[PDB]
């Protein structure tokens with residue numbers, strides 16, 4: 040059974056890329072107990088391409104041309120790469136452009152539950168030039184945010200943010216005054232994933248009061264501020280009535296708002312509403328239950344790599360990354376390339392080198408309780424400091440709390456940009472130097488015998 | 498974080514159910530090793546509700562009466578059951594309605610990655626009368642489809658259909674041509690999931706031709722044909738534009754066009770577009786890729802039960818429920834269980850009972866095929882026959898060609914309905930008689946002694 044039509048292991052991998060007619064894919068799939076690797080590969084190509092359940096030829100002439108082909112396999116590492124003709128893709132009748140829906144439908148649809156396949160995790164795709172340019176892409180990225188913070192649009196550095204504690208629980212005013220309280224030291228305020236229009240903290244009235252406390256905090260600080268308004272809806276016209284609300288209530292302050300969409304749990308149409316309708320605004324892609332299917336444990340679906348890479352194409356200005364709250368204490372691996380794939384114009388994915396031809400970076404939105412002492416070092420490995428940061432541990436960790444934690448963090452960046460070594464810079468700006476007094480065991484190994492040098496104990 | 502405050506192991510479940518201010522959720526959650534069960538559940542209860550990472554506040558002190566509780570655990574069986582107050586769920590600034598997206602961020606959220614939990618899968622949800630009442634609901638079902646086939650709205654029966662095969666290839670006349678010819682047996686066609694505008698076979702023509710083909714078949718048969726057209730796009734305005742091209746091209750027989758949206762690979766806003774812009778047509782929700790969560794090789798997400806229950810609330814006209822397709826010792830994501838939650842105004846799930854308060858229903862959309870002879874035994878374990886059968890002409894494997902298959906299997910349901918044992922029907926209806934010849938494998942064993950009484954000679 041199943042074929043020898045959907046396999047051609049002689050096709051050169053590079054000759055394919057260069058030709059530019061196919062989208063390639065790279066999965067780790069182990070067939071259920073008993074089945075052939077090849078037969079299982081071609082089945083899966085078959086269930087993602089053309090079908091024709093059992094038997095014969097049917098009308099024929101071209102079905103047998105636009106056939107997805109398996110061009111390479113490793114049974115031992117469990118490596119299937121499948122090459123999908125570009126004609127199979129589905130473009131709008133509206134404006135002729137690609138749609139992630141289809142890319143997903145084909146490459147990880149009825150594939151994820153099908154026949155002789157027992158787990159299949161897509162680990163990387165390659166898009167040709169005739170298909171890459173049908174894609175939307177980010178409209179904006181941290182440059183329009185640097186641009187609002189009066190920084191230089193090329194290498195502007197780090198935006199310091201927070202998520203207001205608590206998550207849910209704050210009435211409008213207190214909410215609005217806990218927004219005040221951090222704009223006074225940091226530049227960005229988020230809105231946790233769920234906040235919108237609860238009965239006990241309505242959207243209309245909270246967003247009026249935040250807009251306000253934006254103006255007072257701008258005023259006392261001289262410095263511009265940035266807010267992310269969660270406009271996640273099911274109905275795509277509430278999504279619009281939220282965003283149009285929020286942006287016209289911010290008035291003149293409208294450029295300072297970033298639109299939050301949790302595009303994992305509402306779908307590529309919440310996100311394609313945000314973008315397409317508000318292309319000017321920063322489309323913050325908060326994730327969520329990305330772990331249903333992207334966790335290392337789940338052996339089916341796709342990896343985080345693939346979640347972020349698709350995002351660039353959809354058109355997300357920024358997307359969460361870095362996963363801390365534990366996460367290191369044994370050596371880890373290979374989702375480092377998330378970074379250069381999101382921002383560089385030509386990079387090496389895990390199987391394929393991608394080329395985005397002038398298609399805008401989407402920025403790493405970083406998270407965790409990484410405090411200003413850990414940071415100097417993270418900006419070195421990555422190499423630049425061009426990411427939005429959202430904290431909890433570094434802000435709330437500092438002993439003088441909120442405004443100071445935030446101040447210690449913009450202070451750990453300057454030291455890095457300006458080439459001056461943290462320990463020294465500690466000496467001058469209290470906030471930074473009290474960052475070391477804040478997180479002790481983090482102090483004594485990053486910056487050994489800091490004590491003597493900072494002005495205290497030995 | 499904590500334990501305390503986020504635990505009230507003493508809150509009786511039915512007290513929680515009787516009042517109705519809380520959404521109840523059931524999960525199969527196992528802590529990573531060293532971690533200590535109730536503590537961890539509290540820490541799950543906090544990452545899905547109020548947060549409260551210590552000295553952070555609601556200053557006046559205490560506004561934790563919007564705090565999600567742990568009301569039950571069974572450490573061995575890994576059962577974490579949680580209570581979500583209702584004020585937490587996001588409503589809408591324009592109409593008042595709740596949203597599956599909110600529902601979905603408060604439960605199906607950031608617990609799906611949390612570092613001190615190895616997995617957690619939702620098994621069921623209770624969704625009360627004040628929250629359930631804010632929520633789309635199906636605005637039509639199998640009964641709008643039945644009313645155009647020319648049948649009664651109540652206890653009204655089986656709609657049979659196919660999937661055009663091959664799934665992709667065929668430039669436009671061939672795909673039209675393949676529709677018409679199936680439209681001489683069967684009722685309903687749907688394009689496969691990857692179909693819209695492939696350059697080789699484009700929506701604009703490919704749909705005009707389909708509509709042309711529709712009227713050829715409804716001349717020559719006297720009876721009505723249904724089409725389920727795939728109008729799935731990333732952009733709502735595209736979703737709508739495709740969608741209004743189809744109902745205007747099909748025009749005079751625009752009420753026979755079901756609307757297909759791929760529901761997993763495009764989320765809720767894709768579903769919500771059709772649901773509200775085309776309230777008037779079948780919203781077919783075809784669940785592609787669900788497998789990544791639901792398929793039981795996966796321990797994180799929701800199950801097929803949960804995926805179909807909330808798709809009801811949202812507004813699918815009919816969803817591809819599955820197939821009975823089993824053997825021996827049941828449970829482990831039942832076709833009956835689900836079916837019963839999607840149709841029945843007051844069903845029971847694996848933990849909770851729910852009272853849909855006058856919704857409407859989302860028709861199970863069964864797929865596989867138990868040809869002619871096996872069918873009425875499908876209809877028995879169910880207890881009705883009001884679904885749609887989409888089959889791979891496996892179900893329509895017939896000496897006479899798949900024209901007699903769709904009629905053979907249509908015949909088996911008329912038979913069941915009216916209720917005169919399949920066999921006495923086969924003398925009377927040929928494709929049924931011949932439906933036996935095609936299937937000696939069942940049509941002997943599954944339908945008793947037919948040789949003597951029916952269809953001819955041979956051994």
Ligand SMILES: O=C(COP(=O)(O)O)[C@H](O)[C@H](O)COP(=O)(O)O
Pocket residue numbers: 202232326327358359360361362363404405406407408429430431432607
């Ligand atoms: O709840 C938080 C808090 O921690 P923090 O203080 O770092 O904001 C965040 O919303 C996500 O957990 C992290 O986002 P990501 O999806 O990028 O991991």
Ligand SMILES: O=C(COP(=O)(O)O)[C@H](O)[C@H](O)COP(=O)(O)O
Pocket residue numbers: 149660689784816817818819820862863864865866887888889
């Ligand atoms: O392409 C097919 C194979 O068809 P068949 O099963 O008839 O051979 C099916 O339509 C869907 O993949 C499953 O749909 P469902 O939600 O009903 O499982």
Ligand SMILES: [Mg+2]
Pocket residue numbers: 202231232
């Ligand atoms: Mg959060």
Ligand SMILES: [Mg+2]
Pocket residue numbers: 660689690
């Ligand atoms: Mg199908």
